[PDB]
Each structure stands twice: as C-alpha cells, then as structure tokens.
A paper describes a structure:
The three Protein Phosphatase 1 (PP1) isoforms regulate diverse cellular processes, acting in partnership with over 200 different PP1-interacting proteins (PIPs). The four Phosphatase and actin regulator (Phactr) proteins are novel PIPs that are implicated in cytoskeletal regulation in animal models and cell culture settings. We show that efficient catalysis requires interactions between conserved hydrophobic residues in the substrate and a novel Phactr1-PP1 composite surface, which comprises a hydrophobic pocket and associated amphipathic cavity with a surrounding basic rim.
We determined the structures of purified Phactr1(507-580)/PP1α(7-300) (1.9 Å) and Phactr1(516-580)/PP1α(7-300) (1.94 Å), which crystallised at pH 8.5 and pH 5.25, respectively, and exhibit differing conformations of Phactr1 residues C-terminal to residue 567. In both structures, the PP1 catalytic site contains two presumed manganese ions and a phosphate anion, as previously reported, and its conformation is virtually identical to that seen in other PP1 complexes, such as spinophilin/PP1 (RMSD 0.23 Å over 255 Cα atoms). These contacts include a non-canonical RVxF motif, a ϕϕ motif, an Arg motif, and a previously unrecognised Trp motif. The positioning of the Phactr1 amphipathic helix creates a deep hydrophobic pocket comprising Phactr1 W542, L545, K550, I553, R554, L557 and H578, and PP1 I130 I133 and Y134. The new composite surface is crowned by a basic rim, formed from Phactr1 residues K550, R554, R576, H578 and R579, which radically alters the surface charge distribution.
Numbering used by the authors:
A (entry chain U): 516 to 580
B (entry chain W), C (entry chain X): 513 to 580
D (entry chain V): 512 to 580
E (entry chain K), F (entry chain I), G (entry chain P): 6 to 57, 60, 60A, 60B, 61 to 299
The structure:
Amino acid sequence: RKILIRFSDYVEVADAQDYDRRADKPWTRLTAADKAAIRKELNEFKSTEMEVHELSRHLTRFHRP
Amino acid sequence: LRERKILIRFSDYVEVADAQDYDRRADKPWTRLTAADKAAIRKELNEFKSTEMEVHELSRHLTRFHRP
Amino acid sequence: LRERKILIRFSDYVEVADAQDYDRRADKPWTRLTAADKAAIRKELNEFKSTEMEVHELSRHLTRFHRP
Amino acid sequence: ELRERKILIRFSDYVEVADAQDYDRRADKPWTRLTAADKAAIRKELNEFKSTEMEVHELSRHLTRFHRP
Amino acid sequence: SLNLDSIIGRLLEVQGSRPGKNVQLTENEIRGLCLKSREIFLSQPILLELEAPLKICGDIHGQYYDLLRLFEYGGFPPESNYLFLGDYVDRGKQSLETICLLLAYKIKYPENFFLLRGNHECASINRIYGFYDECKRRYNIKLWKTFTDCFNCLPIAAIVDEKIFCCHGGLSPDLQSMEQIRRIMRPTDVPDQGLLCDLLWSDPDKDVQGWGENDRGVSFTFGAEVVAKFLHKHDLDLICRAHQVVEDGYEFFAKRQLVTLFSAPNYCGEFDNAGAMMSVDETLMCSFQILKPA
Amino acid sequence: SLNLDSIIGRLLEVQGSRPGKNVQLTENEIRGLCLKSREIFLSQPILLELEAPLKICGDIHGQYYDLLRLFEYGGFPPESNYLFLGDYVDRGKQSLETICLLLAYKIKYPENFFLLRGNHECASINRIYGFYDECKRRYNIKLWKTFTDCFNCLPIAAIVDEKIFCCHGGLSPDLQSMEQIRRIMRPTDVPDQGLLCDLLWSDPDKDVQGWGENDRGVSFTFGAEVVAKFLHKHDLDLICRAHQVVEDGYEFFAKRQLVTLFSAPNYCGEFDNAGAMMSVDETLMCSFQILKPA
Amino acid sequence: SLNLDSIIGRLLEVQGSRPGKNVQLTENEIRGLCLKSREIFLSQPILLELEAPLKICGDIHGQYYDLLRLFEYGGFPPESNYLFLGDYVDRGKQSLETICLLLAYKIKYPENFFLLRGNHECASINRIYGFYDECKRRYNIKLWKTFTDCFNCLPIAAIVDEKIFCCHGGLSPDLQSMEQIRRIMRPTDVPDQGLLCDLLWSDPDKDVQGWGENDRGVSFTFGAEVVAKFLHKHDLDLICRAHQVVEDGYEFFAKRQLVTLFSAPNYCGEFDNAGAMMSVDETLMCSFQILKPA
Ligand SMILES: [Mn+2]
Ligand SMILES: [Mn+2]
Ligand SMILES: [Mn+2]
Ligand SMILES: [Mn+2]
Ligand SMILES: [Mn+2]
Ligand SMILES: [Mn+2]
C-alpha cells in the first residue's frame, strides 16, 4: 500500500518553565465511606441532572451502591 | 599450494529444523539522523572517548575519533 | 418431500488454514479409578444433587441420581 | 520419538492410607534471629573451619563452599 | 464488581506463547464470570432464535490454544458473531481457560455470542473426565460447584433464521414439538434418558433406519429418514450438530440434510482430524473454514 | 453577552508571573465559556475532518503555566492551528485556568483550534482526581456540573488529510467502521467499557499480539499487528494519540505507524519527561517540537 | 556478590513466551555481568587458542528468541561448547537480553563458551545502530558506557585446533604474523582502518584476485587466492567468519577454504535466510545444522 505521510528529522528543542510541579494527591486518602458517598453522588447527578442524548443513555456510567 | 595435506573434513549431512516464526522487522532510526544530529553525536563520542572511556596506554592511537 | 422449496445453500469453496502444532496428548485420570472410587463418587453426586445443586421445581424429575 | 520408547515402570491404582501421629510439630527457628554481626561472625567461623580443620579430598578443594567476609 | 476487560485481556495475553502456558485469573474473577453469564443465559430463551451472519463451532474440550487459533482464523468477537455447540471442558489440559474466555465473551457481547450446552456441561460427566480435577487442583471444589450452577442454565438448542436447527448431540424420539424444548425449565440437570438427554448425546448412523443402539451406552442413534421427516415437519433445511470427531472438521449426513461440526483439531493427540466452523451469511449461504494439522 | 477578548487577556496576563497565580474570572464568565464552546462542539462532527497545517498536542493535566509556554513555543492562536488530544484537567493545580483558556481559544478560532475528549474529561474521573475539588474550592459545585455538560459534547476523534487518525487513548476491538464513531450522539458520558471507552483509555503494548490486559484496570492494550491491519483497512498512514507519559514528549510504536504525544513536561513533578507537539504541514510532513525540563 | 544462577534462570525462563518479552535484570546485576565478564576476557588471550568439540555461530543482532532457539537446537551450555563470532547487539530489539545471557554464560562456563568481537561491539557503531538507544530507554547512558568497557576487552580472533582461523569479518593486508594480533593491548577501541579494523570489517569477494573495494565504505574485500595464500603460510585449513547474511546460514568460498556463518534467520525480517551453526568434533570433522524459516 502506498504511503503518503513523511516525517522530518529535525526535532526542535526548547526549555520548559522550571517550577515545582509536585502536587497533593487527595484521591489516595479516600476511605471506603468516602467512595460510597461519591458513588451515591454521581448516580444521583447522572440520573437526574446530567444531560444525555436519548440515544446515548446506554453509555452512562453508573456506579455500584 | 596443491599438495599441502589437509586435516579438516566436512560432513555431507546438513540437519534442518524450523526457526521460530515471528515478525522480525524493526525500526531503523539511524537512517533518520540529521547532519545536526550526526554532528552532536560526533561531539558526544569525542568527549566520551577522550575523557571517560578507558583505553590501554599502548592502544590510544587506535581510538576512533570523529570529525567535528 | 421434494416440492418443499429449500432455502439454504452451501458454498463450494472451503477455506483451509494450518492448525497449531503442539503435543495435545493428555493424561486420562478416569482410567486409574477403581470400583470403590466410583462408588464414593456416586455417593458424592447423590448428596450434592440432593442437598446443594439448585434445580427448578419443574425440573427435579430430570436430576440424574446414581446407584450406590 | 519420545513416545515410542518402551517403558518398564508401572503404577498401582490403589493407594494405602493410614493416620499419622497427632502431636504438635511447631518448632523454634533460631536462624530467623541472626543479626548482621552474627552472620558475619558465623561466616568467619566457617571460613576458619573449612580452611584449616575440615578434611577435604585433594581433588575436591575447589568445591569447598567458602563465605563472603 | 467485575473487571471484564481485564479478565478477557489477561486470557488473550497468552496469544503468541507456546501452548500450555496458563492464565492466572483469581477465584472471585472466575466466580464473577459464572454468576453474570448464568444470569444472561436465564434472561435468554432456552431455545435460541438467532439470525445470520453467524459462525458456528463445535467441540473444544479444553484445547484452549486451538480456540485462540480458531478466533484468529474466523475473527475475534465482535468481528464475527459466534454460536458454540457445547463440550467446552474435559479431556483437555486447559478447560478453565477455555470456558472462562467463552463465558467472558458471552457477557461482553450477549446479543452476538452464544453457547449451547454439551453433554460434558453437566456435573456427573465433567466430574470424571477432567474438569473437576482441574478445578480442585488450581482452586477448589466450591468453584466446580459454581460452574455447575452456570452449566445447568445453558441453553439447549438454537434455530438460525427459521432454517438451521442446532444442538450438541442430535434428535430425540421424544421431540415432537419445539414447545417441548421451550418448556424445559432452568436450572436443570441432564437426565440419563429423555428429550434433554438425546439433544446432547444422540448420534447419526447410516446403518440405522430409524433409531438404534448407541455405542456410548447413552441415548440413541438415528438414521437419515428421521432427519428428512424432521426437516419437512418443521420446515427446516438443516440440522447442525457436533459431538463426534470427523476427519475434515465437518461431515454431512442424509443428503446434506445434517452436518457434524468438530473444532478441536488433532483431538487428544490421538486423531489426525481438522477442526472446522460453518459461516452463515444474511442470505443463508453456508461455507466451511477448517484448521488442518500439518 | 460574552467578553471573550477580556477573558483571554486576563488569562494570558499572568504570563510572566510566578506559576500558581490564579486568573480570576467571574462565575458568569466561566459559564459563558462552557455554554458557547459546547454549542460549537455540537455544531462540528464528533469525528473531526481536519486539514494541515496543524500542530497536535497531548496531555496538559492542569499545568497551566506549561500550557502558556506551549503556546509561546508554537505560537499563540491563530499563529498556528492546534489539535489537543484530551486530558486538560485533573492532577495539576490549575485545571480551571487551563480549560478556560482552551475553551476560549475554541470560541475565538473555531475553525483553527480543536479539542478532543480525554478520559479525564468525564464526570466520574475528574470527580476524584482534582478538577471537582478545584471547582468547589474556588467557586461552587454547580460550576463542575456546567463543565461536565461541556465535556460530554467534546469530539472524540479526528482525521487529518484522510491519513492521520487522532484520539486520546487508542484503538478498540469494537471499532470496525468510522461510521460507528460518527453515530455516537452527544451529549454523552464515557462508559465503563465499549467503543467510546477504548477510544479514550486503551494503550499500545509491544508484548501483546492482538489485545491484552490494561494495567489501568480499564479497557485493553493492543499490539502492532492490530495497528497495521487498522491503517491498511482504512487507508491511513498513522495513529496519533496521547494518554501515556513518554520520555521525549513523543514516542513511536509499530514502526512509526502510531505515535504517542505527551505535552506536560516534568509530569506531576514525578517524571523527568519533556512535553512535545507534532507539526503537520500541507505536504503531510511531520515534525516534532519539544519542551524539555532544564 | 553476584547470584549468577538466578540471573541465568530469569533470562532462560522466557523461553516459550511470545518473542519480544523482556527480562528484568537490575542495573547492578547487569553491571556485575559486565565487570566480571570483562575480567575473564582480559584474563584470556586476545587470540584465542581453542580445541574441538565446539559449535561456532554467526551474527545474532539482538534477536534474543532466535538465540534461545539456537541453544535449544544445539544444546544449552554446557551440553555443547560454543564460539560466537560477534555482532550480538544492534538492529534487533533485544540486544540487552542477548548480551547479558552470553556474558552470563561466559562467567558460568569460561572454558567452554567464547565470544569474539564484532564490528558492532564498538562504541561508534552501537551508538548509532540501536544498542545505545536500548540502554538509555530501559536503564541509562552510564550502563552503555559500562558495556563499552566490557566490549573493548573482547578477544578479536580464535584458532581452533591449529587449523580453523576465526574472526567476525576477515583477513587484512596488514596481517603477516599472528603476533600482530597478539600484541594488541586491551582495553582498545576499533580504529578507522588497519589490521584491527579489517579483521572486523572485511569481506570476501569472488571477483577480486587480491584486494578490492568494500561497499561498506570501510576496510577492503579480499579474493580466494588471498585466502589460499594465507592458509598455506600458516598451515591452516579453514577461515571461519560471519559478517554477511547468506541464504542457507552457511556459505563456502574459495573452494571451501573459507566459510561464512550467519545465525540470525529471516535476518531483519528483510531476508528469507536460514541461521546456521558449524559443529567441529574431535577429529576436525565439521558439520552444519541450520534453522530455516517456513
Ligand atoms: Mn465431545
Ligand atoms: Mn459430546
Ligand atoms: Mn492523562
Ligand atoms: Mn489519559
Ligand atoms: Mn552484522
Ligand atoms: Mn558485522
């Protein structure tokens, strides 16, 4: 099969900003109680308040209780 | 050249088996080196060979340095 | 039994490909059983199918019990 | 080829089964309490033992299992 | 909840390895496969009504790596729709991998992937012929009892586009109306005689006019007249069954009114047979593709 | 009415300030960005058909000052045309500034600036990984529900000059026709499995012949063979995706038939990776521009 | 301080897996392999004087699973003695697995396992042709420099039972006395020309009476009378080399006075060549076993 795409061998390089990118990870501190409450929140939000086209309701990602 | 006696012999039986069957094709990025890339690599090789790569004192004349 | 119009048709092209080549010979453990072994296994199935294996009420007459 | 070679061995379908003694086989594991200095002192003892005391055939001295100092 | 794609993914990851390499699912993963698949089997009729396009396959008997090749050959789900005719476990060395992948695809593609019950999908049979021993060795007895609850809910037959009747074994003298199959309630065992038994055990025999003895010591043999009568009665065109090893993986009977399908090539390393599958297209044109030993 | 030039100006003003400084938009301004950009997403196909010249970028993950530098590097819109491959929010500290600038540029240059949906542009994921918390701390819960309706309308994939297929994660076993993507209706959630899930979650893996398990516990991995038959099937030359951190900001797979792009340098302060963009010109000549941590 | 048996076991237990799967050794284990093997290489002569029985193998170029298949075929050390003729790394995808197993076997069986230096065991070549990229990707640049130190200490040629001269490439116009090879001191680089270069770079050519141009841009080509004159002067019977792919894995030259061995079948996936090895038993009777693609 004929191939049109081509790649250039010149890679432009520049410097990214130098700052402290480390960030807290709150999800690592979620308890079982926390997760269950959040699954409850999402199921209610997605059921009654989130707009979903009629033909894509089978794709809505509900969560276990 | 004609009558020097020869010790080596070759067997007429060649044994044949199946090699593994898998895709051996692999990318060849070195065919994608720019003149800038090759210059930068030439400098790296020259610094490494000249300041880090150990070489016996009697063999430093064999060290393969690259043009700038 | 001939006027009955038939709808199915069969293609005269049969595709053929190679099957994997490995040792499919397998151990047959059921050939090392004894007469006592089978008796214990029959007792096991009767006890399992009577008290453990869920069976719809209308299909209990199909449960295949064994002889002691 | 491997499947066509004649085999003499046979196995019996009946397995005898008796009851083993019923006592407490729990035992202490002194090796689990060896400190780094303990092991280093043991390695030195084995090295001295094997190099000067433990009899070894002349043709097997290369097999003697010495230990890191 | 069930990590379905992870299970399927791990089961497929042995593609390209040498046959024999095991897949290590967890106990709860396997139980989850059984419970959810069972639920689906019960949600769908015991006599399936299916539509082409479809590929139909026969016995596997735990030859897991031959099942992978079969998928490679005919297209992994959902590239093709599949209907299997039973006998997934026993005899083979890897019955767990085979049935777990099959159940997982049932859950992934419940409207495009179907499994029928073979005579080895019952407690008494696969208690002896390997599956029990494989469950007890790699996990425990309870898992085998869990599989049994799932097997007891498998559908028993299928009709494709009102013209191809499919089951593992074959016809029954007790089969006068399709409603007799529809009326069978699940979960159920396979009986030692009767309609459900014959659907999973009976064999065609050229030397038999009507019904005859079965060398298996179970069920009956049946002849070409039985087939012709059956197809005429229900205005069907073909019986598609499995259950017996055949040289080319497929083998016709009674003037191409019945076909036997067998998908485990080099069966048990004792036969020199090909494995086959039958493809049915939207126009009811049937073709065969086979995996032949070299 | 919307004050777009004012928003973009305020958003770009912090350029040169200390990273971490917050751009202070009003609640009503943010909802204006979400509503107007949503409208534009819905007016363009879910499978974008784009034309070079174009610069393609990967994950940003709320590293707002790395995004500003990216635009410094390649040109602030409309100096260059842009295609982003998703994962704008979460993990980073300034997901609001990031997504607001991106939405604002989509409204400013709707024919020269494009955003694809990442797996973090869905409710369940960005509820947990920061963006929800960021919205609640600085504004209210309702603002997060407003962003959700905007993310549920993002396009999912893009084809550049009928030769480069672009999406966040990768390929799907359920993807047999581009029409399957075009029939996905918006607004929609990202499901826990299936086509739309795989398009945002799958990963290449050289160790997998076809499909395999994904360490993420979602979707699958896929191999070079899958990529090869995919490009041949649809007469494509390349797959461009993101989703995974790679050392140089870009990394090829299956003999350059697929490329991973990642644009967040020094990701989470845990990796020493560069961030990269891919330029495609009218010739369909591709080049890579990277921002490396010094 | 090196668990060699654990290292070897891990390298060999991917046998049967899908080709391409990696072996995960620690950085310090790989450093241990290099430093220890380097000491052994330096303790042995630069011109090896070996004795039959022995199996001689040609290029591998990081085709690790073909090396394992070779060992399956010829016998895993120490079931057979082995001499390899160089080019262990570059081009192929798994150079690190390849060289680590070879060095582990050199440490484990230093009197029954031998590795000669190929033109790809020098920093200038394997900086470009893949090995360096492999070290940087999976470990770091420093590890590549540690391999360079080990490579610089490899023996350059070997004479088997005073009748078979072995090197990767071929003869040199600057080779008058074997002493010129012996007097070469290690560690050493590979020069751009001269004896040490030619020995690793030259090729035989049928159309050359004496010496000719080499299409590699390095060293020369040499003719059959050069081979015949060389053998008569040092009373040798065969030149055994590699360096060139040949269709049957082995190919004779100059009336069977020189043989090329190549052990990488289906080389680079570009040729349909077999891989071969040559067995020399105690009587100097030589025989060929080949692994041919199907
Ligand atoms: Mn069967
Ligand atoms: Mn059967
Ligand atoms: Mn991301
Ligand atoms: Mn992502
Ligand atoms: Mn080579
Ligand atoms: Mn070479």
